Chains A and B, each alone.
Chain A
Amino acid sequence: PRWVISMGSCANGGGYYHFSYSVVRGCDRIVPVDVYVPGCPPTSEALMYGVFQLQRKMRNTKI
């Protein structure tokens, strides 16, 4: 029963390095991600708020 959240802008859709040769354009090509926390350095404010949104999703699952 697993989840993943994607912190930052380099980890979703490539980001600052989006046109580089040696980069994966976001971890959507690899892992199925459930919440995105955008921001290039997204403040601990925004990361924690992403975690609260993800906890709501986990509880509404009731697996």
Chain B
Amino acid sequence: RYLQHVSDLHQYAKYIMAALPKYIQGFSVWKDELTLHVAPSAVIPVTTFLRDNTSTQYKSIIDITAVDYPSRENRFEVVYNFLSVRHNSRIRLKTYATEVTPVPSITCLYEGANWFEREAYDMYGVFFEGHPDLRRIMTDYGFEGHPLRKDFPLTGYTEVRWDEEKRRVVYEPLELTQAFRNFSAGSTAWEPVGPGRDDRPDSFKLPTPK
């Protein structure tokens, strides 16, 4: 079953790329999970196609987020997650966005999405052009920085204490009574896992000649 099903998912996604060649750059499958690799100016048409086709009706934004790799020129990748509650299927959509350039917002289509978009905004600084009420959520109001970002340290920059003099809490640069001790320094120096086998069906890898 499961071998047949992952080989079926491969073919469905090959069809999805062939139906929209202008917008879809790649697709990758890894164990009954489908990721669609999409340009940032290509978000809105692909998401309308995912909402609207009868073969492809996902209807429901579950969760979206970014992830930074600082080693790439386009820093953040913005990943979307959908759930066709009709066809009982999940699909994933990745785009990219630098710190300063945007990605357009799907809150015109998906009504739940706006709250997710401003969450990923505060954690990552990734912009959603076309979005009412883009501002911070679930951090401090005067907070300077974006926390879930690799240049930002663990304990942050500031701390809070009650100054007696001003009769108010004051915000001060960071001083610890016990320093943070990461134990990541001390990982393995041998490669921990091998390369591993593949789950590609025989129909979708390139033929050898003769």
A residues whose Cβ falls under 8 Å from a Cβ of B: 19-22, 24-25, 29-30
Tell me if B's interface is mostly helix, strand, loop or mixed: loop
B residues whose Cβ falls under 8 Å from a Cβ of A: 139-140, 143, 147, 152-157, 159-162, 169, 177, 180
Closest beta carbon of chain A to B140's beta carbon, Å = 6
Q: Is the CB of A19 within 8 A of B180?
A: yes
Q: Is the CB of B154 within 8 A of A29?
A: no
Q: Is the CB of B156 within 8 A of A30?
A: no
Cross-chain pair count, CB within 8 angstroms: 29
Tell me if A's interface is mostly helix, strand, loop or mixed: loop
Q: Is the CB of B180 within 8 A of A30?
A: no
Closest beta carbon of chain A to B109's beta carbon, Å = 32
Q: Is the CB of B155 within 8 A of A19?
A: yes
Whether A24 touches B155, Cβ cut-off 8 Å, given contacts A19-B180, A30-B169, is: no
Closest beta carbon of chain A to B57's beta carbon, Å = 39
Q: Name 7 interchain pairs, CB-CB below 8 A, sorted by A.
A: A19-B180, A21-B155, A22-B143, A22-B156, A24-B160, A25-B177, A29-B160
